[PDB]
Amino acid sequence: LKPTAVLRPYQEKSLRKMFGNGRARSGVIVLPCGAGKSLVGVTAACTVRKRCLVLGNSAVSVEQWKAQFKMWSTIDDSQICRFTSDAKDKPIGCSVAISTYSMLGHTTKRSWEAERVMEWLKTQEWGLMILDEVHTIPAKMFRRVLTIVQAHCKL
DNA sequence: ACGACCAATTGAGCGGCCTCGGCACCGGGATTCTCGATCAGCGATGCGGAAGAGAGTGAGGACGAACGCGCCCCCACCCCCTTTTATAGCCCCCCTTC
Known part of the structure; x- marks a missing residue:
């Protein structure tokens, strides 16, 4: 997290409660959109320091997350990829991935190119x-994403 | 004096069987209409499959270029103009004879 990022007390409390020890705890954080929930997510990734996957409900959100990661973290644009049907960044080429529930949770036949990334994501x-x-996660299709992706901790 | 009782009379009202079946209430009957699920709706997402907009390059355009030839100029420099005289044949214009 670049020092430009400013962390508010409620944000710090939520992170401290999530990071009660050296081990990250899984769970849900409820913060208003104006409260900078994006910064908390970015901060959590900067805390975990390990390969992480961000999933948004829309392509607009995926764009927002990319901007926020660049805005708040030292990570470079090439190190971030937006695995999306509408846009390609060679996801396999970088560690940080961003996508949507509609893409990964997709029930019908995947495009051959998207299948390449998804298999890499699965493995x-x-x-x-x-x-x-x-x-939206409790939706029958969106919840499938949790079975498709292998994640150590989910926030 | 009449009031109740007694008798003979009798037949309407009554107590009852008869029977029943119209209706309602009561309860118990397969039910015409209930609810509880499925699927459909409105407006949104995303993915996956479809078209058009830009490209290339055939080629011939206009025409810039490169050359020779061409007309033309400004330029050295050279010769001729003019004068004198000797000298002669050569030549034309004119006069002159026939």
Whole structure:
């Protein structure tokens, strides 16, 4: 996390409660959009320091997350990839991945190119799995993502 | 004096069987209409499969270029103009004879 990032007390409390010890605890953090939930997610990734997967409910959110990661973290643009049907960044070429539940949770036949990344995603283990707007997660298709992706801790 | 009782009379009202079946209430009957699930709806997402917009390069355009030839100029420099005289044949214009 670049020192430009400013962390508010409630944000710090939520992170301290999530990182009660040297081991990250899985669970849900409820913060308003104006409260900078994105920064907490980025901070958690910077804390875990391991390969992480961010999933948004829309392509607009995926764009927002990319901007926020660049805005708040030392990570370079090439190190971030937005695995999406509409756009390609050679996800296998970098460690940080961003996508959507509609893509990974997709029930119908995958495109040959998207299948390449998904198999790489399936085989790799994710240290942190950030889920945005998790109120949608209990959906029958979206919850499948949790069985498809292998993640050590999910926030 | 009449009031109740007694008798003979009798037949309407009554107590009852008869029977029953119209209706309602009561309860118990396969039920015309209930609810509890499925699928459909509105407006959104995303993915996956489809078209068009930009490209290339055939080629011939216009025409810049490169050359020779061409007309033309400004330029050295050279010769001729003019004068004198001797000298002669050569030549034309004119006069002159026939």
